[PDB]
Amino acid sequence: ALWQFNGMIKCKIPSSEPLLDFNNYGCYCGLGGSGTPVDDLDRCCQTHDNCYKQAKKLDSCKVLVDNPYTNNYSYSCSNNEITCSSENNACEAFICNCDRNAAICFSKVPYNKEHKNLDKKNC
Numbered sequence: 001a002l003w004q005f006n007g008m009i010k011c012k013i014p015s016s017e018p019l020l021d022f023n024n025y026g027c028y029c030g031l032g033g034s035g036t037p038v039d040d041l042d043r044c045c046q047t048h049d050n051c052y053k054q055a056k057k058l059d060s061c062k063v064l065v066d067n068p069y070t071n072n073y074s075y076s077c078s079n080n081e082i083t084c085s086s087e088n089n090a091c092e093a094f095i096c097n098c099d100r101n102a103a104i105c106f107s108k109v110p111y112n113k114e115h116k117n118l119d120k121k122n123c
């Protein structure tokens, strides 16, 4: 869910306030996402959006009537390193991986301020 994701981002980027920093960035970071990603950080978000769509097609998630946005998986942050819990079931594990991959991605690409709060006409 959002609480875990926010925590994962802070794990990899300790200087960030993810809800302030990564929400509403480019064409994909935030609600929705369409068009061509504006930069590499936007591409991280596009991949994450796609990862959530995929999660909805997994049989384990479907039988559980799961929602990636509210999924209650467990993870731990140790020395800026994220670990998805082994106790997570197949569906929770997949979603945890989507979140971990995105958090790592965010930490490896440049942040371009001019792409914050992009008017979607550009998407």
Ligand SMILES: [Ca+2]
Pocket: 028, 029, 030, 031, 032, 033, 045, 049
């Ligand atoms: Ca999005």
